[PDB]
Design a protein around this motif. Structure first.
Motif, PDB file in Angstrom:
ATOM      1  N   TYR A   1      50.419  13.916  20.835  1.00  0.00           N
ATOM      2  CA  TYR A   1      51.233  14.974  20.263  1.00  0.00           C
ATOM      3  C   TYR A   1      50.403  15.858  19.342  1.00  0.00           C
ATOM      4  O   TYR A   1      50.464  17.071  19.495  1.00  0.00           O
ATOM      5  N   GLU A   2      49.591  15.312  18.438  1.00  0.00           N
ATOM      6  CA  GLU A   2      48.744  16.159  17.591  1.00  0.00           C
ATOM      7  C   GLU A   2      47.809  17.050  18.413  1.00  0.00           C
ATOM      8  O   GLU A   2      47.645  18.223  18.088  1.00  0.00           O
TER       9      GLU A   2
ATOM     10  N   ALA B   1      50.319   8.792  17.492  1.00  0.00           N
ATOM     11  CA  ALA B   1      50.885  10.066  17.929  1.00  0.00           C
ATOM     12  C   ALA B   1      49.824  11.101  18.358  1.00  0.00           C
ATOM     13  O   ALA B   1      50.143  12.253  18.645  1.00  0.00           O
ATOM     14  N   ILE B   2      48.559  10.681  18.423  1.00  0.00           N
ATOM     15  CA  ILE B   2      47.391  11.524  18.697  1.00  0.00           C
ATOM     16  C   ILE B   2      47.558  12.484  19.883  1.00  0.00           C
ATOM     17  O   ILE B   2      47.080  13.615  19.814  1.00  0.00           O
TER      18      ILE B   2
ATOM     19  N   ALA C   1      58.313  14.391  18.910  1.00  0.00           N
ATOM     20  CA  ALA C   1      57.532  13.685  17.912  1.00  0.00           C
ATOM     21  C   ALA C   1      58.417  13.167  16.773  1.00  0.00           C
ATOM     22  O   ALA C   1      58.290  12.018  16.362  1.00  0.00           O
TER      23      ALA C   1
ATOM     24  N   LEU D   1      52.186   7.773   9.859  1.00  0.00           N
ATOM     25  CA  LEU D   1      52.169   7.056  11.078  1.00  0.00           C
ATOM     26  C   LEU D   1      50.835   6.486  11.477  1.00  0.00           C
ATOM     27  O   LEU D   1      50.757   5.756  12.471  1.00  0.00           O
ATOM     28  N   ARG D   2      49.743   6.857  10.788  1.00  0.00           N
ATOM     29  CA  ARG D   2      48.397   6.343  11.085  1.00  0.00           C
ATOM     30  C   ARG D   2      48.157   4.930  10.556  1.00  0.00           C
ATOM     31  O   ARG D   2      47.275   4.251  11.084  1.00  0.00           O
TER      32      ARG D   2
ATOM     33  N   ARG E   1      50.430   4.196  18.470  1.00  0.00           N
ATOM     34  CA  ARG E   1      50.022   5.566  18.812  1.00  0.00           C
ATOM     35  C   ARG E   1      50.859   6.092  19.973  1.00  0.00           C
ATOM     36  O   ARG E   1      51.478   5.318  20.702  1.00  0.00           O
TER      37      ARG E   1
ATOM     38  N   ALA F   1      59.326   9.388  15.168  1.00  0.00           N
ATOM     39  CA  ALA F   1      59.113   9.254  13.778  1.00  0.00           C
ATOM     40  C   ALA F   1      60.216   8.478  13.102  1.00  0.00           C
ATOM     41  O   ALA F   1      59.994   7.474  12.416  1.00  0.00           O
TER      42      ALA F   1
ATOM     43  N   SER G   1      53.278  17.206   9.444  1.00  0.00           N
ATOM     44  CA  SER G   1      52.095  16.797   8.794  1.00  0.00           C
ATOM     45  C   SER G   1      52.303  15.536   8.005  1.00  0.00           C
ATOM     46  O   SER G   1      51.540  14.566   8.078  1.00  0.00           O
TER      47      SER G   1
ATOM     48  N   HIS H   1      54.658  13.248   8.338  1.00  0.00           N
ATOM     49  CA  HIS H   1      54.956  12.231   9.270  1.00  0.00           C
ATOM     50  C   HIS H   1      53.714  11.668   9.903  1.00  0.00           C
ATOM     51  O   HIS H   1      53.457  10.459   9.902  1.00  0.00           O
ATOM     52  N   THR H   2      52.883  12.529  10.505  1.00  0.00           N
ATOM     53  CA  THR H   2      51.650  12.039  11.145  1.00  0.00           C
ATOM     54  C   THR H   2      50.746  11.367  10.123  1.00  0.00           C
ATOM     55  O   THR H   2      50.088  10.392  10.468  1.00  0.00           O
TER      56      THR H   2
END
Lengths: 117, 286, 286, 286
Positions: A77-78, A74-75, A24, A66-67, A72, A28, A60, A62-63
């Motif tokens: 990975y979350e 990264a959903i 992830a 990234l929104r 995507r 990033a 946290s 980073h995500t």
């Protein structure tokens, strides 16, 4: 013999988690000289609770970042974090040497899978 | 090689406002922080470069005042120039079998180049010139308290390259620190100056430069930066007279009592200084 | 083009009323504010842009008053035009890498492209360095007091799309600032003007621009703006004469004693200017 | 089609005398007031419908005098129309991709669509062609005083909220100011006229529209909004000769000091005009 999604052994799960945090982070911040791996591989295996706590802050952040952008991964990975962190009850303060061996396998196994595609 | 006659130590305070003091190559270009605590950091190397710049600007190439590591210097040619100015043909790494030859180069480059004379240098490549430690050293700068960086989005309305979606609005970003306060420590040792010739006029020049550092480095990326306080401790003998950590403890900074929200100005803090032990003289240049 | 011979610092003060001074790329179009305290912010880029457009307007594209950052234009063609007048062809990394030819396009830019002679430039490349650094620089503007943005809606009598809108008349959206006051800082460097040749004429023009800038940029979303105050500090030497921070402290802003509740006019505030140290002279707007 | 020769600024004053200036959507004919102070606010967009209305009422479909906005209409209809007229396939969410025929839609609309000769058929929420920045603009209208209205609980059931009330009858909250004067600011730009062909004919029509606006808008809550005054300032050249705000300062408006108690009539207020500089000429009968 390959990645087992059902191993449910704590040091195996910690290895998987580490591997995917690496992946992830990669997405990033491109172009880094050194990866989190290079920085923290040893420490993570010696002091789980110590570092793991720390890393998740940055993840946290980073995500959060990234929104904005439409891109995507990264959903996925979350969700993967959220599965592994739900299976892990708690973070050991430290691990027996023999256990630190098993942590390496979970990491490699997970990595290969993510290496694909 | 005339040199200073006392042992010195000092502390410096500087401030930033709506800017990026020092970017991180490994974090995109994020300001450097302490992950575990969230304090800020500034490398010494940065400060050193600033000083060199200032000097260069000021002196204007006067002999005994050249800078060895100019911003785009070819370092092996610059060692070769120091070498050949001392009649030497270039050779690698270590000092020659006759270390004296590179020592002449050392002598010559110490003579002419201020920053080598000051900071020392590895001064060694596939053209050697010797080695030096330098009488002057510095530590990391640390934020007095946690800092929370922001980042902002900007738009180029015009575009450099051709675009398929067309003109297109194309966005970059900036990283910014609302406000922060920093502290720095440093030392000076007489015995090494005795070895390099680091003189007193050098010292006064040094201080002068250090006070006026920021005035010349205005830029887009950097916000408003300024120096606030400067305290100097001078010992009475060629060697120490007290432990260093005790001296740095005499200076204490605490939140101004009228300040309660997040810090946003130098007025939000109170700075205090204690008395100096018997063997030390404390004077305040800022 | 003779270079200026003095160091300059300036302060500007301007209004806003029932509008969006600077939309936020992220938070929809919300005005940009500091999340911790709610003060408003305006990027320097905006100012730069505005200035550019004003200049372009007023000067009418006359000789030696070109602009290289042309609106909605392929700026690789504007750096092509900078280079091909010098018999050279487009390069990233630097003005065409061989330093004499780099300097020929640099020169053939600086001589005529006002915007480059003033603000400096890069053809934006990941190594993010070199090319030319602006003799003129400026910082972020911030509101003197916290602001209260709000969304605003209208009863439009028409719809964007096939809709059930039309019991009450069709909707709209906007965001506005009831009222606000902003301040800004800037700097001018002699040495860099010596490098670019930034001339006095330029300075004059600059002043002129500053004063008149706002008038030419009326549109629906901005509402209304106005330049209120401008003060200029002139050093009496090539180099500086005083600390910047000190200078900025001479000007003070406070709410008019009679005003109460949220401010709604420039009359709600009071301004003051002290005297300056002998090394610097003070003169008001333009 | 000639472009206007000079820059123009105007102030419009209309009554809310024992009436309502503009309905706040959520409460019917509630006046849009500053929630922090309660002084009267009117949407900048307020006047535009009325403008268009008078256009449609006096010109009534005259080729050169078409209107863009139509009650219960679809916003993209006029976009579609302007593209059709110029033999383009509608692209109402983008500039017409054949830019010489974007100029034809622009020409055709700035011809037929007088209101697009006047205002931008472009974007704040959705776009049309975009690009066509409006040569005429005006700001949010405001009340002269804190005019928190005297509520008028009208004896009616036909309102957004139904009730079992239909001993007291059903009520919807409508409001009138005992008396208030609303103020509006506007601008006229020659340079954009040059692009759009705004003409003196247009100007006169504009005047007429301004005068005749409120004849089309009356109701119990609306009460009286007479077009009390319309002062127009003319510049002597292409480009202005004074700050806008200065001009507006000349239009001094306040309650008639001879009037006592809460205001109920325009007689409770006085309108005065200071002399504009030679660079401006003021007309005051509209």
């Amino acid at each position: 013999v390959s990645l087992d999604p059902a191993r449910t052994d704590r040091p195996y799960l910690l290895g998987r988690l580490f591997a995917v945090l690496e992946k992830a982070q990669e997405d990033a911040v491109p172009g880094a000289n050194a990866t989190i791996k290079d920085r923290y591989l040893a420490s993570a295996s010696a002091n789980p609770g110590q570092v793991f706590h720390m890393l998740l802050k940055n993840a946290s952040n980073h995500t959060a970042k990234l929104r904005k952008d439409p891109e995507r991964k990264a959903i996925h990975y979350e969700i993967m974090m959220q599965e592994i962190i739900d299976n892990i009850s708690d973070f050991p303060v430290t691990m027996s040497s023999d256990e630190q061996g098993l942590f390496m396998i979970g990491y490699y196994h997970q990595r290969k899978a993510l290496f694909t595609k | 090689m005339t040199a200073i006659a006392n042992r010195y130590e000092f502390v410096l305070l500087f401030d930033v406002e709506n800017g990026n003091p020092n970017g991180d190559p490994d974090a995109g270009n994020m300001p450097r922080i302490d992950p575990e605590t969230g304090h800020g950091l500034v490398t010494d190397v940065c400060l050193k470069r600033k000083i060199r710049n200032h000097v260069a600007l000021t002196k204007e190439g006067a002999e005994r005042f050249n800078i060895y590591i100019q911003e785009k210097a070819i370092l092996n040619e610059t060692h070769e120039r120091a070498y050949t100015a001392c009649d030497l043909k270039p050779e690698p790494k270590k000092l020659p079998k006759k270390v004296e030859d590179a020592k002449r180069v050392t002598d010559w480059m110490c003579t002419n180049f201020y920053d080598i004379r000051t900071f020392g240098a590895v001064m060694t490549t596939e053209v050697n010139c010797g080695q030096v430690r330098g009488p002057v050293q510095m530590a990391f700068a640390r934020s007095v308290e946690p800092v929370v960086p922001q980042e902002v989005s900007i738009t180029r309305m015009a575009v450099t390259t051709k675009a398929e979606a067309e003109d297109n609005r194309t966005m970059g970003r900036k990283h910014i620190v609302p406000y922060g306060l920093y502290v720095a420590h440093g030392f000076i040792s007489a015995p090494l100056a005795e070895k390099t010739g680091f003189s007193d006029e050098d010292l006064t020049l040094f201080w002068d430069a250090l006070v006026n550092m920021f005035e010349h480095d205005r830029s887009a990326a950097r916000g408003l930066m300024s120096s606030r306080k400067l305290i100097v401790f001078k010992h009475q003998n060629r060697l120490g007279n007290a432990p260093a950590h005790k001296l740095f403890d005499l200076v204490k900074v605490s939140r101004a009592e009228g300040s309660s929200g997040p810090a946003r100005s130098f007025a939000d803090y109170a700075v205090t200084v204690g008395q100096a032990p018997e063997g030390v003289e404390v004077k305040e240049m800022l």
